[PDB]
Write a protein that binds this DNA or RNA. Structure first.
Ligand SMILES: [K+]
Ligand SMILES: [K+]
Ligand SMILES: [K+]
Ligand SMILES: [K+]
Ligand SMILES: [K+]
Ligand SMILES: [K+]
Ligand SMILES: [K+]
Ligand SMILES: [K+]
Ligand SMILES: [K+]
Ligand SMILES: [Mg+2]
Ligand SMILES: [Mg+2]
Length: 1336
RNA sequence: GGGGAAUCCCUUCUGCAGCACCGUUUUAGAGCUAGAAAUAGCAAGUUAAAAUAAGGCUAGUCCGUUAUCAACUUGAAAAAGUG
DNA sequence: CAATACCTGGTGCTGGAGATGGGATTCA
DNA sequence: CCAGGTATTG
């Protein structure tokens, strides 16, 4: 008894099928367990497991870190309160107790209800004097009087609780505060450098123009307009643009060749500036640094909108400015509306439901919604011009706690905190003693490279301590070992050398590593001149000369340089042909040139004695990111360099790690030669063996030493192994389920292993990434396309509009603008034609007026287009608006275009799967199935694991009319698996040589023809560019075994796809995750509310509702009834919530008695997870959605003829085929038009038996009878929509044409308590059926 | 002969750590006047405290939403076994 | 009870490693 | 976007 298995692995399904020799699906009697009269049942061996998607760990992580931030913010306040404790007890012995209980109702409070002062006169007086906290903050910063200790606490607490961001290193307000003074200094520096062309900046109000609440480019336009004889793209204009935050190009200013694009925000600017300064000199450094200072002031002027010489609290004064203008503007708005629109006043100022001032202050209206609600009312009235100005500046009626306070750096709050401490330490000695402690509470951050400050009970922690004692913000540097911690942060993430598993890999930018990479590439270079008979390798002396003369004097070494600067200069060759490198060398000595710039001592770099020192320096610069730690580590070399060099050295940092270890590169030596790997790369006689040859050469000891160094460690379990794969957790869920399905199928077949296993694996928020890409690209481009055409992220889900913005509103094959409103008239074209590369992503598509203008449709865009457009394409590449892959495919015609080999490769790629994840699944199945070794100790492959891509069965389905309609039911997953088994087994039966291509385990026109016609053996006649005919029966050529009988096997496939009994099993799952919805609801007289804290009665405090049920439980017990508490027997479903789950499981009887049940039959408790399956009357099935709702449980097996009619009539897929075959399909659609009514009838019978939605079914029948005159295509398309009424699972809304059908829900689970519960194995072939009516 | 390696250019995704700003919720910020009352007319509004999974023991400036799960038998569990 | 309409926490930033698909040079 | 919880309305 021989059989094969087909598998269809997806993110929400695993289809499976068992086939025999004749491509038939077996069927068996399977035993049924349980308490019903059915002892067995007949099952076909085909089906599909369905399951909810596996989730990433991201949401879990974001909640976990937020949790930590709330804990630490609370600890911050606790540190401050501990510092204040004793002196506060002398002033007000319960002040902190009133703060802690502020949330409680007066009934529950233990102290007086007024928090700050504990009496109403003083509390009212406080709020009258300080209407916002920022009033109190400003007062305490500016005033010189002794102040109440409770107000000092509230000010410091407010700063420490909401302390601002940490994006700026170092201290602030370093005389970079004033925009006027920094603009003056920029003009002074510029006029120093350009005495003949000076700028007249008198009368120019730089403060107002650059700090105006306007766009960067408009402020640039304003300032340049104030300077006659200067254009925005001149040098001074470009400096101002750089200060405002734009991305100016300094190339034309200094007549450069290298594009000097500079943005002060990019990480590369530090290098991008030195780069530019290398071409123009360092006299200009003082200029570009002057512009940088100006930017800081301009950034500060966005936050601090008040004169900094009238107060040391400009932030608080700016909030107070918000409050005063809010008050004045509210008074004016009230008066204006009173006078002009007196009837709207109540709606504006009393109705929280509307987006007026009432809904803005008390309702749910945001600042944006309120501005939208009141803009027409202001434009409608008179005297609202200044209010409209403030509204369009987003500066009308502002609150102080707003979404845009994310700009505020912590140094600002720190400045006010420090000033308050300096004022009041003169009156409170403990503030003087604790001033720096309090500052440290605000400033201290746990470094990202330290992680949680755990003590052995966190699986996320890596931090190590220097001493075992509690860590505080003040003892952190002494208790935490930051060095060891930062080292572990990297090392727990980096790979070891695979060749020497106990050796750490080198830093990617290490000098040794770059020598290795350069010599490895250079040793395989060959050259020819005239008098030479044969190309020659470079000798050791030639390679050393090329390294010293070229690689150690240029960052990049081109082939032109090799030819001219070496072969001409040294070897006296006028012509020489180079091979083994193209255009320029890929490897380079970048660190060598970095350090040469920093330390300026070539002889230090070239002296092998300093090799270790330079290796340790780069290691430090790679391993650590903190400049203080870097400085501490480099301190041991301080005596070798100057303090200037040491400062430049610590500012230089690298990231990234190599893939080989130092011990491998330059440690182990060949036993007889005594030479390391690097020694061989430098000089290897005339063989010039590279890395691969060296470690694979049996005459050297490298290979054997690698073999000895290997280890294996502890083996992963199957689950572990799958978890460590690279891929989406969703597809990893499908992989594990697939393995479990195969194990059960083998057990079904009497532990006999199959002959073949054929696997196919499906292909695999976003709008904000689209908007970010376009914003970055457009601002890098310097374009105003977002000025002229504002777009929202949702709109970018349109493919053409997204392409329009990515192309800067231009045609891509023609140098012309496109029109947004004409997008429907344009074409979206494939760069590499989709007949070769089935790529439909933006990486292979392009928006053009007319696809004709590409050239010839059979290849890459033509050479003429490439000559026209390569410059524009390069700008798109630099702005990252197209990728390197896209640019290379666009420009390929200048490299010969598509060769015949490229076309052969693309066709083969459409058939031979090469994704890494599918290889891993095949390796897993193959290593589980094949475990024995033969006489030569080689693996015995009893089971061939075959992998196919989806196109094979898809083309098979379309070519032989086995069409799929996904919406009809879930059978197509199973059918896909069946067709994979059939096609895959037949393919390797017919062409066993292709086993290397499709089976796991160890001329261009010819292969193009071959792989294009690989599947023709299925056809009876093939029309290929004339008509050839194949025999009825197809056999293998060598064995003579039959592989495909076209008279009998297609009938077998048809019968298999027509079987109505298919094992669709929805994986039952316990629900996990959040306890409930997160919304904190207002107080309500409802027992659905859940307390947010143990003592917060939700009727007084509000709280949550809508908990998630982890699983339901069948309880058979008694409950008290009536005022007499009489015991009445019950049987019901109790949903255990996720929050309740631990308590219920720790002791179920006590849990159930607490819920009210008595005398619980403990052994009749049935755990019922989501999607538990119940069967009622007439085959009607239901699934548990929760404890109080059910899902649909039945599948609608629509006969094959109706499915194929629906596919053809609806044009479900593209109308590909001969026009005569198109006509025959159209003729069949029209000859079988009565099928439409029959399909409705099939749906109707099904619903009346199983769905029971009388209102919906009647609305549907009326809708179908309403559009009987509609075209057949559209009626078929809408019949596809109808199947939502019958689909398995949760009910859902759908539309028949323009009629909307709302979902009919099953809001009661009472009936399943007397139905039959069905427990299903993973395949559903094994069942346990429990008649629940026999309980109770 | 290699779906194996290094390098260059990138693309995409997965794991983790550190931080900010809002939002919500209860309370505090004396509403006034005319009416016996429902109510009417007016005044006012911007701020704060505290919580932000209930909580846990291991008591850390730690942990608490990912992954994994038919039933049954033997099991404390892990597990293995059962058609 | 069964049916209907409404609800549903969100945004921004910093740092690091790996594997990954695929074009290119050299190899095993 | 799904789809289960919830209060309103009968
Ligand atoms: K009280
Ligand atoms: K000008
Ligand atoms: K609001
Ligand atoms: K190259
Ligand atoms: K680093
Ligand atoms: K020195
Ligand atoms: K789960
Ligand atoms: K889930
Ligand atoms: K199951
Ligand atoms: Mg907490
Ligand atoms: Mg708040």
């Amino acid at each position: 008894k021989k059989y094969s298995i087909g598998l269809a692995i997806g993110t929400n399904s695993v289809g499976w099928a068992v086939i025999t020799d004749e491509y038939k699906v077996p069927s068996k009697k399977f035993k049924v367990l349980g308490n019903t009269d059915r002892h067995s049942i007949k099952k076909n061996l085909i089906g599909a497991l369905l399951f909810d998607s596996g989730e990433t760990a991201e949401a879990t992580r974001l909640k976990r870190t937020a949790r930590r931030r709330y804990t630490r913010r609370k600890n911050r306040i606790c540190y401050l309160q501990e510092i204040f404790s004793n002196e506060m007890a002398k002033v007000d012995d319960s002040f902190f107790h009133r703060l802690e209980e502020s949330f409680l109702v007066e009934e529950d409070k233990k102290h007086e209800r007024h928090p700050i002062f504990g009496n109403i006169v003083d509390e009212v007086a406080y709020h009258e004097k300080y209407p916002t906290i920022y009033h109190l903050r400003k007062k305490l910063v500016d005033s010189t009087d002794k102040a109440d200790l409770r107000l000092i606490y509230l000010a410091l607490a407010h700063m420490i609780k909401f302390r601002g961001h940490f994006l700026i290193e170092g201290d602030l307000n370093p005389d970079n505060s004033d925009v006027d003074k920094l603009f003056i200094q920029l003009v002074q520096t510029y006029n120093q450098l350009f005495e003949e062309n000076p700028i007249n900046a008198s009368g120019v109000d730089a403060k107002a123009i650059l700090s105006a609440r306007l766009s960067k480019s408009r402020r640039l336009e304003n300032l340049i307009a104030q300077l006659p004889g200067e254009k925005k793209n001149g040098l001074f204009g470009n400096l101002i643009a750089l200060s405002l935050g734009l991305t100016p190009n300094f190339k034309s200013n200094f007549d450069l060749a290298e594009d000097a694009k500079l943005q002060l925000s990019k990480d590369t600017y530090d290098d991008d500036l030195d780069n530019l300064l290398a071409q123009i000199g360092d006299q200009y450094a003082d200029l570009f640094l002057a512009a940088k200072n100006l930017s800081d002031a301009i950034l500060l002027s966005d936050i601090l909108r008040v004169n900094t010489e009238i107060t040391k609290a400009p932030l608080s004064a700016s909030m107070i400015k918000r409050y005063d203008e809010h008050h004045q503007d509210l008074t004016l708005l009230k008066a204006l509306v009173r006078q002009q629109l007196p009837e709207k006043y109540k709606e504006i100022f009393f109705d929280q439901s509307k987006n007026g001032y009432a809904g803005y202050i008390d309702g749910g209206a945001s600042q944006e919604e309120f501005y939208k609600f009141i803009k027409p009312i202001l434009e409608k009235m008179d005297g609202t011009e200044e209010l409209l100005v403030k509204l369009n500046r987003e500066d009308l009626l502002r609150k102080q706690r707003t979404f845009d306070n994310g700009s505020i750096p912590h140094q600002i709050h720190l400045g006010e905190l420090h000033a308050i401490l300096r004022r009041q330490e003169d009156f409170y000695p403990f503030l003087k003693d604790n001033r720096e402690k309090i500052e440290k509470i605000l400033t201290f951050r746990i470094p990202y490279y330290v992680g949680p400050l755990a003590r052995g009970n966190s699986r996320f922690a890596w931090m190590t301590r220097k001493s075992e004692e509690t860590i505080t913000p003040w003892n952190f540097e002494e208790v935490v070992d930051k060095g060891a911690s930062a080292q572990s942060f990297i090392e727990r993430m980096t790979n070891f050398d695979k060749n020497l598993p106990n050796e750490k890999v080198l830093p990617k930018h290490s000098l040794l590593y770059e020598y290795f990479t350069v010599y490895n590439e250079l040793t395989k270079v060959k050259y020819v001149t005239e008098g030479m008979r044969k190309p020659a390798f470079l000798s050791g002396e030639q390679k050393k000369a090329i390294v010293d003369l070229l690689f150690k004097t240029n960052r990049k070494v081109t082939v032109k340089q090799l030819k001219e600067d070496y072969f001409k200069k040294i070897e006296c060759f006028d012509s020489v042909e180079i091979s083994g490198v193209e255009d320029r060398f890929n490897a380079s000595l970048g660190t060598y040139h970095d350090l040469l710039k920093i330390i300026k001592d070539k002889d230090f770099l070239d002296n092998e004695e300093n090799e270790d020192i330079l290796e340790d320096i780069v290691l430090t610069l790679t391993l650590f990111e903190d400049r203080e730690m870097i400085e501490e580590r480099l301190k041991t070399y301080a005596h070798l360099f100057d303090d200037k060099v040491m400062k430049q050295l610590k500012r230089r940092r690298y990231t990234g790690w190599g893939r080989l270890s130092r011990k491998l590169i330059n440690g182990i030596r060949d036993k007889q030669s005594g030479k390391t790997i690097l020694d061989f790369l430098k000089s290897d006689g005339f063989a010039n063996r590279n890395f691969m040859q060296l470690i694979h050469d049996d005459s050297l000891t490298f290979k054997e030493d690698i073999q000895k160094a290997q280890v294996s460690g502890q083996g992963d379990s199957l689950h572990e192994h799958i978890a460590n794969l690279a891929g989406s957790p969703a597809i990893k869920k499908g992989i594990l389920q697939t393995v479990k399905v195969v194990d059960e199928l083998v057990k079904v077949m009497g532990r006999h292993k199959p002959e073949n296993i054929v696997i196919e694996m499906a292909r695999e928020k976003n709008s904000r990434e689209r908007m970010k890409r376009i914003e970055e690209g457009i601002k890098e481009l310097g374009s105003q396309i977002l000025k002229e055409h504002p777009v929202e992220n949702t709109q970018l889900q349109n493919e053409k509009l997204y392409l329009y913005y990515l192309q800067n509103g231009r045609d891509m094959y023609v140098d012309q603008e496109l029109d947004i409103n004409r997008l429907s008239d344009y074409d979206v074209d494939a760069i590499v034609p989709q007949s070769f590369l089935k790529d439909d992503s933006i990486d292979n598509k392009v928006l053009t007026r007319s696809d004709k203008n590409r050239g010839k449709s059979d290849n890459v865009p033509s050479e003429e287009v490439v000559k026209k457009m390569k410059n524009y394409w390069r700008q798109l590449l630099n702005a990252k608006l197209i990728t390197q892959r896209k640019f290379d495919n666009l420009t390929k015609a200048e490299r010969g275009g598509l060769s015949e080999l490229d076309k052969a490769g693309f066709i083969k790629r459409q058939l031979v799967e090469t994704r890494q994840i599918t290889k891993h699944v095949a390796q897993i199945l193959d290593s589980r199935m094949n475990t024995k070794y033969d006489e030569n100790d080689k693996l015995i492959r009893e089971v061939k694991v075959i992998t196919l891509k989806s196109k094979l069965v898809s083309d098979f389905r379309k070519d032989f009319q086995f069409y799929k309609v996904r919406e009809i039911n879930n059978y197509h997953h199973a059918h896909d698996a069946y067709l994979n088994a059939v096609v895959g087994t037949a393919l390797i039966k017919k062409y066993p040589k292709l086993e290397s291509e499709f089976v796991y385990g160890d001329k261009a026109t010819a292969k193009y023809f071959f792989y294009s016609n690989i599947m023709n053996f299925f056809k009876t006649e093939i029309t290929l560019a004339e008509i050839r005919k194949r025999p009825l029966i197809e056999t293998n050529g060598e064995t003579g075994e039959i592989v495909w009988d076209k008279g009998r096997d297609f009938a077998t496939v048809r019968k298999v796809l027509s079987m109505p009994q298919v094992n669709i099993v929805k994986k039952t799952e316990v629900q996990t995750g959040g306890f409930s919805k997160e919304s904190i609801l207002p107080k309500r007289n409802s027992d659905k509310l859940i307390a947010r804290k143990k003592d917060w009665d939700p009727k007084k405090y509000g709280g949550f509702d809508s908990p998630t049920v982890a699983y339901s439980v069948l309880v058979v017990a008694k409950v008290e009834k009536g005022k007499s508490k009489k015991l009445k027997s019950v049987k019901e479903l109790l949903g255990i919530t996720i929050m309740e789950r631990s308590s219920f499981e720790k002791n179920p009887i006590d849990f159930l008695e607490a819920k009210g049940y008595k005398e619980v039959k403990k052994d009749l408790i049935i755990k019922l997870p989501k999607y538990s399956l119940f069967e009622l009357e007439n085959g009607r099935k239901r699934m548990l959605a929760s404890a109080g709702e059910l899902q649909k449980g039945n599948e609608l097996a629509l006969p094959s003829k109706y499915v194929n009619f629906l596919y053809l009539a609806s044009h479900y897929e593209k109308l590909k085929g001969s026009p005569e075959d198109n006509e025959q399909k159209q003729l069949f659609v029209e000859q079988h038009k009565h099928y439409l009514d029959e399909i409705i009838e099939q749906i109707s019978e099904f619903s009346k038996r199983v769905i029971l939605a009388d209102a919906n079914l009647d609305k549907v029948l009326s809708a179908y009878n309403k559009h009987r005159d509609k075209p057949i295509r559209e009626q078929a398309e809408n019949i596809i929509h109808l199947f939502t009424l019958t689909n398995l699972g949760a009910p859902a809304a759908f539309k028949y044409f323009d009629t909307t059908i709302d979902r009919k829900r099953y809001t009661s689970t009472k009936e399943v308590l007397d139905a039959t519960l069905i427990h299903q194995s993973i395949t559903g072939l094994y069942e346990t059926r429990i008649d629940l009516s026999q309980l109770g």
